[PDB]
Amino acid sequence: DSVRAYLKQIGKVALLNAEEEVELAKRIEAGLYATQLMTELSERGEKLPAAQRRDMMWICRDGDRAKNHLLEANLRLVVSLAKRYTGRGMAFLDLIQEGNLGLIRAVEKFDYTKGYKFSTYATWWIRQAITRAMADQARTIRIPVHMVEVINKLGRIQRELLQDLGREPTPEELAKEMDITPEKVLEIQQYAREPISLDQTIGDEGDSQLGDFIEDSEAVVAVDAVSFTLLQDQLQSVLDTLSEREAGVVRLRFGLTDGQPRTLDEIGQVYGVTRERIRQIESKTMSKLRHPSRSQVLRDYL
Amino acid sequence: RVLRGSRLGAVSYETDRNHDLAPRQIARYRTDNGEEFEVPFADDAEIPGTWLCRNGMEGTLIEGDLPEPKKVKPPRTHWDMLLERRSIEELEELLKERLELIRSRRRG
Amino acid sequence: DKIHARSTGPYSMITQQPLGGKAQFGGQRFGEMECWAMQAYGAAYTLQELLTIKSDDTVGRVKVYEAIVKGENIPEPGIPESFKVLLKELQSLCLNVE
Amino acid sequence: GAMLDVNFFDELRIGLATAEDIRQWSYGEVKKPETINYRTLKPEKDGLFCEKIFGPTRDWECYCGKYKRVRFKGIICERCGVEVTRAKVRRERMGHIEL
Amino acid sequence: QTDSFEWLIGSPRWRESAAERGDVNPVGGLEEVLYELSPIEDFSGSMSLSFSDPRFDDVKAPVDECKDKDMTYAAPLFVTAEFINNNTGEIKSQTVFMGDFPMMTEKGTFIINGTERVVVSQLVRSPGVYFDETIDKSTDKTLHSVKVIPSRGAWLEFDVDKRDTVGVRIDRKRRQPVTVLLKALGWTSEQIVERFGFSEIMRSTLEKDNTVGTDEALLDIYRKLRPGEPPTKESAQTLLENLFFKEKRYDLARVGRYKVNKKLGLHVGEPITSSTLTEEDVVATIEYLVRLHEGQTTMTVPGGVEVPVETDDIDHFGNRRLRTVGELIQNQIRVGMSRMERVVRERMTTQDVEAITPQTLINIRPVVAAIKEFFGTSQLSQFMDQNNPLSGL
Amino acid sequence: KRLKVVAAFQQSGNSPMGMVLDAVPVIPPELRPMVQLDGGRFATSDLNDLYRRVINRNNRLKRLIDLGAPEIIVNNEKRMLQESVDALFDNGRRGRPVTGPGNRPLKSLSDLLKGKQGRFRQNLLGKRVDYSGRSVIVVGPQLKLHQCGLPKLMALELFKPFVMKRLVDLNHAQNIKSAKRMVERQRPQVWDVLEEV
Amino acid sequence: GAEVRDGDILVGKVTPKGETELTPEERLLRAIFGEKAREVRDTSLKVPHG
DNA sequence: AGCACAATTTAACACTTTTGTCAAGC
DNA sequence: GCTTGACAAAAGTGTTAAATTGTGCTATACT
Ligand SMILES: C/C=C/C/C=C(\C)[C@H](O)CC/C(C)=C/C=C(C)/C(O)=C1/C(=O)C=C([C@H](C)CC/C=C/NC(=O)OC)OC1=O
């Protein structure tokens, strides 16, 4: 048990009290300003004397020690809070860790001179970071936090209007309720629509995965491919059925030779003629091409 | 019962023209651990010296340009979180406090 | 209710494979009993064709289809797909493979 | 000894993979536990579908879309940051993670 | 199917039905659920909730229409539930909509969303006092044993060890002497040999009991039961009684108690109740067991007619009961109401005091969820194969 | 026993140093596809959340080291990490494997092994090939030994490529597509060329 | 009351398919044939086999 | 939970040049 | 055969605005 192992780990230290908070915070303050003046003399400020050096570094080290100390003391409260959020979405130890981080942040930004309990000011940062990471890493598809909040309000109001109406309310009722549009509600729900796994068996006799019944609608028709090939083949035949500059212009205008269709600009460029000469060209060409004589074979490829 | 799917990408089908390709440039970027990664870029393509390479870390160009190294500071320090909320004079108070503290400790 | 055959239909999504199941086309699975069997017979090419160009060769499938449409000698069986898949798996299991 | 796997297979040696060979393999290290946009429905940078490491899911189509012609290939839109190519190397390429 | 269903209903049809053959208390399965759930009270005991009158409403639509429009043929559920604060005492009586509830066809089936399923009755050997003596051929000795497996309870063995000793392994423990139980049960070695004079292995083990005094046995039991735990003296009675006599976490069925007394002729002339056990039960157990590994034919316990000394069968019907349709339904009802009450008691304190109503206290969502997930999503709730009237039947 | 593995490494030019892992590989995404069905709620491949846990823990403990933290939680997170990695390779091997909704266990990479016969040689059950047809069987007492009956409808679907080719050889279908839709139409001369094919 | 056979159309249903660069070839066929794009994809109901 | 703000994204739109079009005659 | 001038629709261009989204913040006490 890593859970209970860490539990025994954390029970190893006892709690503290007000003056504990008092002296530990004041110690850590002393250490931080000590290291501050330390880096002050880090740039050229002085040949720092021996006793001053020893006890300033000592103050630093001591504030650090008490720093870890209080955190340790409050880890029990960390667990006592985080216990009540599990059974949903995200694993427990990770919740523990992130509550630890939020503990870090709160104890960082904590004041004693406001003369409160440490835990009180802590709990804000605590549950904040907790629920934050909750919205963060509870979906394999990440979602904006405000999206999460609106979804939460949605589900709340949903159970509300359920027990009120006695039945599942209407989506129009709901959109009316949260003062947004029904399609907006729909989009919200869909975004609030969790994915499903492909590693369960649809059959009650379990031998086939659920993913063994998914038609790949973006797969290869294949015969269509050779169809496309022979398409090109009869194509080039018909291209050769007519004059040169015709087919050249056509391939250039359709990207048929390069994959990039050229405008009348490029075409009359390479030929040295006007656009509108090319337009005459194209007119006569599509006239010639638009013959049932020519399209009898060709119509089939549609 | 039919259940179809589709990966979210397009699949065309041309012929593999090995002969005719867009010509293109080649660059050498250096990493922190002096790694050299090389990327064929288009001819008409700026070669930005910075690039996170196959290494996965960020890698700069082979050359020396140095437009702007960082232009960015650290986010915060717990020093700062205290400093905004506590005075330098408070700091010196607790400082000389602990000075006499350690004194009247071991050295009385 | 039982009569059913197939040549070519809707390929897989996970694997590259045209759907089994007589609700859809589906078809018949040539597995372990008549493999070991074909080996017993000694005929190898048919088995190879089955396990390659009717099983996994993505390109080879349309290739063979083309060849049949054109009335031409069969292309050669390409590499299986699940083979390479297992290969990548073994790799990603932190395993020097080659 | 040929990773492209064309018809010539004398022996098949196995062995423990070195960390170098690992990092020698991958084309980049993912660094975001992300998959795809809920809304645009597309992969994410440093996510477990980043085409920059994996490759395009769309045949010869850079991420920004600056190119969509197979004549463009062996190249990368610096803006998109992914190589215009076939869309099946994703079937092949491996990603790594430094702990 | 009709009768299971109506009993679970408790319809007056069934009311006169069971009344036809005694059945002094015609109780429907739902009534049973009420009596087994009520009252509802806080651990502080400051406030009290209760139920009454599980009353069916008419179906919301006709069977043909329900099938066609794919609405599962059901009907509402109303309950005369009542809350009262133990602190001062005030009635909070509501007739709560328990939820729309499916209704059996007149062909004994059910329509879910227009779909037509069939529930199946599942065979199970009932919970009971189960006997056997597998001869240790390596010892060439019959090894008489017992495993009294209750519903929602713990196991226990009265084993004929290879030695002339007691196989008093209990609740999956690995081994006990009977003496530890008796002194743990408030029995002196005098009391045991008195109660068990012809008991040869009993006298032997009581010579090898190697522990004297009740509380010594109590502490040994407690430590061996919670090994890795500090022994405490009040847990002597305040654990075992909870383990095997506090009938809130250890309760074989009423039919289990019935099977017990009937196998033993203990509760000869009274209706079945109190699924908790009794030292009476255990001692008659031990007496019959030792006599079975004694050479016997039948033994009349004080207060009980002599039961013929013999083994038991898991295969024989006399143990193999039949969980019916209404049976399984009540099982689902119980499992849902468990979750629902353990959240009512949750709010029971968190709910504001002297301002709540059971309406504020009630959540039928989990129960209806269980109902739905039972009708659907169950290998016992299966599609009626209607290829013809025959195979349908 | 020990000298076995000792000589194994010694003989080998390998190194047991690689036995520890420091940099983790990742499967291609295609083999772990996030494929889509019709409507927006798509399909996944069982490894994604594994990698997610790994990434989250790694980044977390990374920034933890960055900050400088009491080593207790450091070791805790590291243990968590190693557990995650083990779950990835073969979860359920050590401790209890990792959770979701639906009362049903996990599947590491180890479980994706096709053969994957451990301690029992079950049935094999490969990929169910193509180009067959099933049916019930009946006697051909009139038939010769070498022969075999056949539902014309069935083989009709069978030789579709062959028949289409041979018929477009005839002047009966201009393109292949004509042939295929004609197969859908079954114009009786279809049966005629079916004969020869 | 209409007779039917496998593959025949059951219900005329359709949805948009989206937008992709047409092949030059298909564009040519449309041009010679004056045929529109109709990006909405053809998703009807056909009777399955047999 | 909720608010604040902040960067970041994108879409909207006003304008411009470009390209396809025409009608012209030449 | 062919060019001209003119013409509008269309592809960009770019700016600005709106929305979107990542991030930080809260002080009775509660281990
Ligand atoms: C890359 C290989 C690494 C080592 C192998 C491992 C880990 C596999 O775990 C065992 C081998 C195996 C099984 C792989 C299955 C794959 C690739 C797959 O997907 C199949 C498949 O599932 C079935 C088949 C054939 C139908 C199996 C026929 C066996 C015949 N045996 C025989 O002829 O008797 C001597 O091919 C495949 O490629």
Ligand SMILES: [Zn+2]
């Ligand atoms: Zn791009």
